[PDB]
């Protein structure tokens, strides 16, 4: 087809950089601040392996270990990006809980789930190694990338990759 519309939900604990990553990709800017309590859907046209997509990104407000994941929430979602911050242990423990709840929601439907460790630019504050995030992702059979919302190419790589994974499963 000439174009495919795909919707990806961006999940994770408060403050890990879900809005900033999404805005870096969509607008090519690192925003000073963006309301942490707001959920918006952003869109961007991207081409992956010659195929054009209208990618819709649902920048969720945030989840924690008491968040819920009714099957209702999964309607029209084609893939999930689970974000933690490499500077926050809490955020990494939370993404593990979110993933298990997510799996319960989506069951065995063929939709991609990838893991993203964000804020990789904060070297002095890092508390999670690359390898710890990669091993988690492997245990999930999930793609893994680290990012910085201050680095446009790392934002682009994240959203290109979730579309590549979606295509492999379709
Ligand atoms: N240094 C750095 N700060 C980041 C990065 N991503 C987000 N931030 C900052 O982290 C805070 C939370 O970011 P936000 O995008 O609002 O997180 P959200 O709650 O997941 O949407 C804000 O002060 C952002 O400026 C990143 O990759 N590097
Ligand atoms: C697509 C989606 C959006 C959500 N928003 C919240 C509350 O921030 N939880 C969510 C779960 C899903 C799957
Ligand atoms: Mg936000």
Author numbering: 2 to 171
What does the paper say about this structure?
Growth factor signaling into mTORC1 is regulated by the heterotrimeric TSC complex, which acts as a GTPase-activating protein (GAP) for Ras homolog enriched in brain (Rheb), a GTP-binding protein that is broadly expressed in human and mammalian tissues. Rheb is a monomeric protein with a molecular weight of about 21 kDa. As in the closely related small GTPase Ras, the flexible switch I region of Rheb undergoes a conformational change during nucleotide hydrolysis and exchange, while the switch II region remains largely unchanged. Point mutations in the switch II region of Rheb (Y67A/I69A and I76A/D77A) impair its ability to activate mTORC123, implying that the switch II region is key to Rheb’s function in mTORC1 activation.
